[PDB]
Amino acid sequence: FTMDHYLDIRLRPDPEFPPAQLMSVLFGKLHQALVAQGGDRIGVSFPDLDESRSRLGERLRIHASADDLRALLARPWLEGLRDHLQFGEPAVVPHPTPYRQVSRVQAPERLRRRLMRRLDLPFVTLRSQSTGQHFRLFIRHGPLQVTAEEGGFTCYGLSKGGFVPWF
RNA sequence: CUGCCGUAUAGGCAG
């Protein structure tokens, strides 16, 4: 398993902004840092996740190799967001751990539009750079399993087939 | 929210 490193980022509490909004901004920032990085070997997970209350939790975990993680952190992608963040230290993941894939999940009038011309899940609220439309990006943490499969990750850090250690 | 792939009105994706 080559993605044996991680970094924990904690949202600092803030009366002005609820955790969900803070996490969304954080996630959006990670997204732009990922498209700048250009690869598909960096994943995420939300270790404090509350499946029952469809809440992502106060924590974002970044998964990558020691080198991919290092490069990612060299970038000024957390510019103007640091004061809202608490940083764990880049570390080798514990072992053993189960593995799971964290994926974006998607599910009438739009389906009617395209046709003519022819989700109880936690989420982040994002912003399409060009259109300016705001959309909810629903995230699912899949069933735990013993080993990790080969696979990559979206530029949002979501599973494109790849798994991340869960702990 | 908007679009894409697909006969789909199944199932997949993109911001």
Q: Is the CB of A95 under 7 A from strand B?
A: no
Least Cα distance to A6 among A103, A98, A94, A104 occurs for A94
Return the structure tokens found at A167: 């702990």
User: Under a CB-based contact definition with an 8 Å cutoff, are residues A19 and A58 in contact?
Assistant: yes
Q: How far apart are CA A62 and CA A87, in angstroms?
A: 11
Structure solved using which method? X-ray
- What is residue A139's three-state secondary structure? strand
Sign of CA dihedral A11, A16, A20, A25: negative
Residues A34 and A113 in one domain: no
**Does residue A31 have an active-site annotation?**
yes
Q: Are A11 and A30 in contact (CB under 8 A)?
A: no
User: Does A92 share its domain with A143?
Assistant: yes
**A86 vs A22: CA distance, rounded Å:** 12
C-alpha closest to that of A81 among A14, A136, A127, A135: A14
What's the structural domain count of chain A?
A: 2
Residue nearest to nucleotide B15 (CA to C1'): A128
Host domain of residue A137? 1-107+119-167
In Å, how far are A13, A41, A165 from A1, measured between CA atoms? 34, 12, 10
Q: Are residues A67 and A30 in the same domain?
A: yes
Q: What is the resolution of this structure in A?
A: 2.3
User: What is d(CA A157, CA A70) in angstroms, rounded to the nearest whole number?
Assistant: 16
